[PDB]
């Protein structure tokens, strides 16, 4: 329904063993389309989805350098943060940056964001108003002031509102067969026995897109969410996704309980019971 | 495509 262009950057200091690992990737919704790995052969931002190959080297070179500069920021940041936290030259450490836009069904701006983090913890982030800064440490307040004085929020807001959304829409038209398509779930049940008076019920759901989905078990209307087990959404590799939700029951009395599907690939929801 | 603005050394 709504859509998003998202860019995930990862940066890992490996002291002794040289320059830090740096991996930029780029998603439209849940489809990956650009990548950069510092340990790649190319040293070029590559295409990871056919519909961005259309764009000539003009696009690519400009993206390559842009990403090279992102890495060059983190390169220093690692240096600075080791500074700020008084940590050792011996230790490896991680920065993740993450920015992107969100556009509704009508394809117009709703949310932008710029989350940043050192070693897994939140460090600084651009707040939902695209104007203020939030930051979990006094260390990060030093960065927050730095970023206030510089007026990053200005530059960054005009990207997130502006540059991001017009580029999001350029991609949603290029690969509309890839991206705008909705593949529908393909559900079933694998029922197996744990004991003589007991049995399992997995409500599967394969080959679907996008990864948004909600499967809950209902004992003929009763919201069963204690005995259930719900694994996180696998990517199939395919391009489609997978998911199941398990539950154990007083078995024998099998053909009683309901699996509630929820997806925009399937116009109105579903319910299933044992054959 | 990527940002080319609004990005700074911490």
């Amino acid at each position, epitope marked *: 329904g709504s859509h998003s262009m998202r860019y995930f950057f990862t940066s890992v200091s490996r002291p002794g063993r040289g320059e830090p690992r740096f991996i930029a990737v780029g998603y439209v919704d849940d489809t990956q389309f650009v990548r950069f790995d510092s340990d790649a052969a190319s040293q070029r931002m590559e295409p990871r989805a056919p519909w961005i190959e259309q764009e000539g080297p003009e696009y690519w070179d400009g993206e390559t*350098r842009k990403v090279k500069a992102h890495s060059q920021t983190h*390169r*220093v940041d690692l240096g600075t943060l080791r500074g700020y936290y008084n940590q050792s030259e011996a230790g490896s450490h991680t920065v993740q940056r993450m920015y992107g836009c969100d556009v509704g069904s009508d394809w117009r701006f709703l949310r932008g964001y710029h989350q940043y983090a050192y070693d897994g913890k939140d460090y600084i982030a651009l707040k939902e108003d695209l104007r203020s800064w939030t930051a979990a440490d006094m260390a990060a307040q030093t960065t927050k002031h730095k970023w206030e004085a*510089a007026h990053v929020a200005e*530059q960054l807001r005009a*990207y997130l509102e*502006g540059t991001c959304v017009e580029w999001l829409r350029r991609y949603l038209e290029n690969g509309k067969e890839t991206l705008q398509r909705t593949d529908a779930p393909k559900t079933h049940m694998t029922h197996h026995a744990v004991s003589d008076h007991e049995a399992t019920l997995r409500c599967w759901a394969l080959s679907f897109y996008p990864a948004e989905i909600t499967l809950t078990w209902q004992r003929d209307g009763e919201d069963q969410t204690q005995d259930t087990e719900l694994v996180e959404t696998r990517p199939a590799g395919d391009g489609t996704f997978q998911k199941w939700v398990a539950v154990v029951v007083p078995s024998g009395q099998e053909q009683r309980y309901t699996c509630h599907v929820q997806h925009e690939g399937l116009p109105k929801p579903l319910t299933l019971r044992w054959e | 495509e990527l940002a*080319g*603005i609004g990005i*700074l050394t911490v």
Partner: T-cell receptor
Amino acid sequence: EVEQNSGPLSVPEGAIASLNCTYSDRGSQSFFWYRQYSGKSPELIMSIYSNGDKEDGRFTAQLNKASQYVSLLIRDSQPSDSATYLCAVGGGADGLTFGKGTHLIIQP
Amino acid sequence: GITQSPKYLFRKEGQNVTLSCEQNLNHDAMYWYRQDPGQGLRLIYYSQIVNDFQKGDIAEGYSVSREKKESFPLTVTSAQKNPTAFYLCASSQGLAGAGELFFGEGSRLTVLE
């Protein structure tokens, strides 16, 4: 690459003066107007990152990424505003290409 | 501020010369341009981060170091058959081309035959 309307251009004291500029790269994300007096070092007067107008009292710039249009116009123009005005474009981690320039000379 | 020195200079072919340019704003980006009469300012080099620098299109016959983040010295070598120009140092806080570009105060190099 960054083609700038060019004269030189004359405008009397108080008259409004406008300067356009256009750029041939969609990757452009940041847009600037610098001013340069002869034998002296360019200084920023206007910077703009998204579409529409930005104003600082007597100067007012405007941008249309779609048309690839970046503008400046000077209100109330003083002689202080003589000598060369510079369109510059960035946002691609490649530095900054400055246009040809436009020498705008104001009549006192 | 940014200071480039010296305001003027000239050295005879066979010898190099260097235009030292320092800044204390703690900007990551630094740049050198040469402005010729008629033309605009062409980019010689820019330098995104310490120990690193990148070509423009008129770098043939120019050296730049970035040993420290403070200074971006531009050596005009026994360079090309036409270095006579106006040279401008500049810093900017952030990515190269993203921000204000705080300029030095120019340099007027000439050949001596």
